[PDB]
Amino acid sequence: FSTNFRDTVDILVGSLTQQVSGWLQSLEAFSTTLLGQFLEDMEAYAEDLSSVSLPKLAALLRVFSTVVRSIAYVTDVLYRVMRCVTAANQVFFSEAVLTAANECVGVLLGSLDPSMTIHCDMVITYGLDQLENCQTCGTDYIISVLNLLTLIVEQINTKLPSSFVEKLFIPSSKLLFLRYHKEKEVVAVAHAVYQAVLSLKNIPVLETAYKLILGEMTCALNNLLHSLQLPEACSEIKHEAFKNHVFNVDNAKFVVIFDLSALTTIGNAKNWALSPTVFALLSKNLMIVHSDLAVHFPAIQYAVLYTLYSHCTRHDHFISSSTVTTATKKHFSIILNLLGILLKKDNLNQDTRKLLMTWALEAAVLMRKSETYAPLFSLPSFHKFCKGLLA
Amino acid sequence: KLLPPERMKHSIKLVDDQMNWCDSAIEYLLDQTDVLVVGVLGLQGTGKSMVMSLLSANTPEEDQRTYVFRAQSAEMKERGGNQTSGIDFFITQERIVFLDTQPILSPSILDHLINNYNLPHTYVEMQSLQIAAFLFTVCHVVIVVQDWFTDLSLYRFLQTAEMVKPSTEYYPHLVFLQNKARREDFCPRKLRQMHLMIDQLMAHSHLRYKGTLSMLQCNVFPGLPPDFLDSEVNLFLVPFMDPLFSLLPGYRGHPSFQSLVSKLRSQVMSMARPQLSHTILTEKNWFHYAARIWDGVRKSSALAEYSRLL
Amino acid sequence: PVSLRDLLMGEPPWREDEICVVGIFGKTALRLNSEKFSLVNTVCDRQVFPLFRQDYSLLQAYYSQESKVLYLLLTSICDNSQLLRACRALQSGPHAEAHEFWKHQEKLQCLSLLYLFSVCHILLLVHPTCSFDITYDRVFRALDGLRQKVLPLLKTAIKDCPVGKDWKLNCRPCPPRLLFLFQLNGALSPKRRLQHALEDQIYRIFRKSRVLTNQSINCLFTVPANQAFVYIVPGSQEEDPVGMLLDQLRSHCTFTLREFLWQHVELVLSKKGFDDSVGRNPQPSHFELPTYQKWISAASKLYEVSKILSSIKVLFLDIDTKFS
Ligand SMILES: Nc1ncnc2c1ncn2[C@@H]1O[C@H](COP(=O)(O)OP(=O)(O)OP(=O)(O)O)[C@@H](O)[C@H]1O
Ligand SMILES: [Mg+2]
């Protein structure tokens, strides 16, 4: 068996790679000394490069990733060596070698656990360099780069500097321009990146990202209002990074919907102490979408109501409360008042009306189940809710 | 001693597929006056038969196999052929006449005529023009069904047909029906462009394509003010066939198919019925007038003039 | 992705490389994402055209080095993007002025189409519905004759070109191959049967109207005799990004076109050419594989083109005007 793998490796080093890869992985000391040959080969090829050796490098990277996946101090050394050998070849600029190297680095980094202090400056600069020049790339290179970024963010938890996310959510960042791809896979990986960034336990590094997202949403909303011949609003969550910018109608709508969908990472959390609460942001800050934007752009209103309903249904509509308990001592009243005001309107859409009715029915059925919610029938919001239901 | 004459169960053939008159509808006609005539026009797969059936004596919850007007079957779509041939006839209990129509300039008829003028190509165009003129001179209203927006060739055809019509001029109302609409087409921004294009493309059509059948007042758009549109033409959109939080359905962005169908039917039935000729006509009189008009259109002179030009 | 006029004026990296010219044309409905842009992006597998970005005609050119293929997209009054602008301009700034305006627009579109029909290797026509308008049969019939009255003038301007011998005689590299692309549009393996029926109907209609003949020289275009030339794009969630985003939010809260084109591109890229003649006596068909500079040398001369306006004014609203 020691020499049997040599023939398979030689054959695979030449669409059939999946079969040999699976066979080798299912087939299974010697690997420790065997990886040295590949490492030396890559180093020698990189040194001699300074252009037909690219296919060989790609094949070697693929076989190396397959053998390592078939399966604690040399991991950092090997990772640094691979990163240096990959970054050295900065002349040919081949997409195959870059994709293979990205996959190899991702699996190597994922092999360990986020319980060490490995060198992060090299990985961060490598990811940023690859992202800064991945605009007009192939459909696979973009996905590989995004996956690598997600893995890097997840691996480095609470240790990522604020500058990492500060330059990642700015208009000049290419990440914001990668979500416009027509393929659903690109949008999915982009959303995954946003989810991973927003799923951090470090409040100081997450506050800047949250503020940047809110600023972008405010800029898009202001652009829509200006294009609809109406004054701007939501000046309490504006950002300096988006002081002067232009967003098209379709672009603004897409950006607002994407940000609202991305906010579900923190909105649907299972227990994040930020200044603008998600509930207050979707119930009081974004109150202009129901005045005039609900007629020309009902999608934004529907998305806001849907995310608010999804966030409230996971906490039993905040009935027990009516630290966390004291902070949410006035949520049911606000929900009832909002439902009553929205239902009493006469300029609602079919989808919006159906969603509001479903929410109202769920809240009502909920009201009488307890025998302890009797005092909740005297507050004025309940009267407004009943009036809306009757009207 | 006042029971109705009879009830029609299925539509009949008013004109044979060979462009021949079929006098077989007098058995269901009376001597009453103030009759309404509705006609339809469109391409091959627009869905004129389904619309006519749903608007005359059918419901969306019913089945397509029992419709008053035969619809295209699944086995026919794969072959790329047409279903409706000639002109149909059907009258509801409210004494409302409905007239169907075969596709105009459809490749199915052309292919069927290949294995059967200078070339067998202008014949289809002339048949379409004949049907359009006939529907424009003996019908109270004509509904144009379009599969997609802005074909750019239907407007020219309509103008040419009205220019070669047989004959203080009478011009029936024109309705623009956009079948198989999507969410993107149910936005005010797109609606303004649609109305603007329709108005600019038919500035000198002489037809009554505005001032009636305004979907804006039919509660379709709750908060859309009437002044938001420079000129609201008669255009209607028909969409495609259609613990508690997890059961919420998908977001379509457009009203229900049944609601829009019912609204369209009500608006069509509540339309005006202006006089056709310079005298009052009854059901039997209208039938005879239509027969005479068709006979005159067949052996007309303008058609020959247009024929020698192709 | 630059304008054709802005490309001929201006190469060293690909001064001499065998390429294939592919023309794209047809109608397009009123939508945010046009069919041509999506087609180019899908074929090139990259975002060539980024999302959210007197006369009413335009010709765009794009080169692909990874595949060595040039694409020429055509936009005219047929597309809704240009029609909307034309209507908006006409709204602000008589029964006789509008007719002349539309006639001029149609003539310009016809001239552009004729230009594309003589400097392209493979061309494809798109449509928003499965059914194809028979009006095209007449358009082509009114286009072929037009080139017959312009061919002597075109060969005079490209006489001093390194294109070759057959190019100077036929004013074209080789008989272009036309492809048809339709969309499901909610209709309906049934796809194969529908495609075969559409191909048979198109072939019969074109043969009856004398548009397609046995000889592959006199005819302006031909179709394959044993391969597939009709593709139907199935429905997908790519269109209307708002709907896709909403679906993703809801989920979180709880052959092929490429192969269809390479099947024909591999023939021209291998210098084999095309051979479509079943008139009981086929004859060889001229074919050439020029380079970048070699193709531009003739494209610029053909695009720069006295008597063209006079010849184009003799050729549709002409019938309606005459009848009126
Ligand atoms: N709004 C719609 N939504 C979904 N399917 C539809 C719609 N309208 C029509 N269809 C279907 O598409 C096809 C359209 O053909 P249909 O029988 O309605 O008439 P048609 O296209 O006018 O026919 P003909 O070929 O005789 O002109 C049918 O199979 C019908 O069931
Ligand atoms: Mg029918």
- Cα distances from A34 to residues A30, A39, A62, A108, C249, in angstroms, run 6, 9, 15, 16, 47
Q: Do B79 and C193 touch (CB under 8 A)?
A: yes
Strands B12-15 and B96-99: unpaired
Nearest C-alpha of chain C: how many angstroms from A29?
43
Alpha-carbon distance A50 to A56, whole Å?
Answer: 16
Buried b (16+ CB within 10 A) or exposed e, B67-91: bbbbbbeeeebbebbbbbbbbbbbb
Indicate the domain borders of chain C: 1-235+255-305
CB B139 within 8 A of CB B37: yes
Q: 3-class DSSP state for residue A234?
A: coil
Sequence-separated (6 or more) residues with CB below 8 Å from residue B151: B43
In ligand 1, which atom is closest to the CA atom of B240? 3
C neighbour chains, 3+ CB pairs within 8 Å: A, B
Q: 3-class DSSP state for residue C101?
A: helix
Alpha-carbon distance B21 to B11, whole Å?
Answer: 16
**Smallest CA separation from ligand 1 atom 17, residue:** B71
What resolution does the deposited structure have, in angstroms? Answer: 3.4
CA of B301 to the centre of ligand 1 (A): 35
Rounded to the nearest 5 degrees, what angle is found at the Cα of C87, between the Cα atoms of C86 and C92?
A: 100
What is the full DSSP assignment across A123-171?
A: HHHHHHHHHTT-SS--HHHHHHHHHHHHHHHHHS-S-S-HHHHHTTSST
H-type alpha helices, chain C: 5-8, 35-44, 80-92, 95-116, 135-157, 166-170, 190-208, 241-253, 257-269, 292-304, 308-312, 317-323
Measured from the Cβ of residue A390, the count of other Cβ atoms closer than 10 Å reads 8
Put simply, whether A302 touches B (Cβ < 8 Å) is yes
Q: Do A348 and B222 touch (CB under 8 A)?
A: yes
Alpha-carbon distance C244 to C250, whole Å?
Answer: 10
Nearest ligand to the CA atom of B41 = 1
**Smallest CA separation from ligand 1 atom 26, residue:** B84
Amino acid letter, residue C290: P
Cross-strand bridge partners of residue C75: C58
Q: Do C197 and B80 touch (CB under 8 A)?
A: yes
Measured from the Cβ of residue C251, the count of other Cβ atoms closer than 10 Å reads 9
- Cα distances from A336 to residues A55, A112, A321, C272, in angstroms, run 64, 49, 15, 75
- Cα distances from C233 to residues A178, C39, C180, C195, C256, in angstroms, run 25, 10, 11, 11, 9
Sequence-separated (6 or more) residues with CB below 8 Å from residue B274: B140, B170
Amino acid letter, residue B139: C
Helices A380-390 and A332-344 sit at what angle, rounded to 10 degrees? 30
CB B108 within 8 A of CB B82: yes
* Residue carrying the six token digits 């690909």: C14
> Does ligand 1 have an atom closer than 6 angstroms to the CB of B71?
yes
Q: How far apart are the first and last CA of chain B?
A: 59
Query: Which of B63, B68, B72 most suits a substitution to test ligand 1, by most atoms within 8 Å of the C-beta?
Result: B72
Measured from the Cβ of residue C209, the count of other Cβ atoms closer than 10 Å reads 17
CB A6 within 8 A of CB A34: no
CB A247 within 8 A of CB A221: no
Q: Which of A139, A188, A261 sits opposite C45 (nearest CB)?
A: A139
- Cα distances from A326 to residues A274, A362, C250, in angstroms, run 16, 24, 31
Q: How large is the C-alpha radius of gyration of chain C?
A: 21
Chain B: residue whose CA lies nearest to A291: B223
- Give, for B41, the enclosing helix (H) or strand (E): strand B36-42
Alpha-carbon distance B269 to B94, whole Å?
Answer: 9
> Does ligand 1 have an atom closer than 6 angstroms to the CB of B50?
yes
CB C285 within 8 A of CB C217: yes
B neighbour chains, 3+ CB pairs within 8 Å: A, C
CB B232 within 8 A of CB B226: yes
In ligand 1, which atom is closest to the CA atom of B74? 29
Q: Do A139 and C246 touch (CB under 8 A)?
A: no
- Give, for C180, the enclosing helix (H) or strand (E): strand C177-183
CA of B258 to the centre of ligand 1 (A): 16
Nearest C-alpha of chain A: how many angstroms from B222?
5
Please name which of C230, C228, C195 lies closest in space to residue C125, comparing C-alpha atoms.
C230
Sequence-separated (6 or more) residues with CB below 8 Å from residue C227: C263, C264
CA of B131 to the centre of ligand 2 (A): 15
Query: Which of B13, B41, B49, B50 most suits a substitution to test ligand 1, by most atoms within 8 Å of the C-beta?
Result: B50
Strands B12-15 and B36-42: unpaired
> Does ligand 1 have an atom closer than 6 angstroms to the CB of B49?
yes
In ligand 1, which atom is closest to the CA atom of B145? 22
